């Protein structure tokens, strides 16, 4: 177990069975965005 942990095997298996097989993805500004004032432009 310890040798595997140092070799990084367990972390790789973690990533594989948690993220490399996840249905979902892998992974800011308060300035007003154009979506807030779209009706004005329309």
């Amino acid at each position: 177990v310890l040798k595997l942990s140092e070799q990084g095997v367990l972390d790789k298996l973690k990533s594989k069975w948690w993220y490399d097989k996840g249905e979902c993805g892998s992974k800011k500004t308060s300035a007003l965005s154009l979506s807030n004032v779209a009706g004005v432009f329309y």
Binding site: L34, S35, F41
Partner: protein
């Protein structure tokens, strides 16, 4: 979603109607010019010659 490019496209869409109007005016004026040209260009009447010349000048200025 709404973005800068979409607004540009909307504005160009609104402004291209103006270009369509301008070209339609062009072709109408040139159809009138053809009606004047292909039709007999006799200028025996001074009044008729003056009227035709002023029409041509007006269309050119437009």
């Amino acid at each position: 979603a709404f973005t800068f490019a979409a607004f540009c496209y909307m504005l160009t869409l609104v402004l291209c109607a103006s270009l369509i109007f301008f070209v339609i005016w062009h072709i109408i004026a040139f159809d009138e010019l053809r009606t004047d040209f292909k039709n007999p260009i006799d200028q025996g009447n001074p009044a008729r010659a003056r009227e035709r010349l002023k029409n041509i000048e007006r269309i050119c200025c437009l």
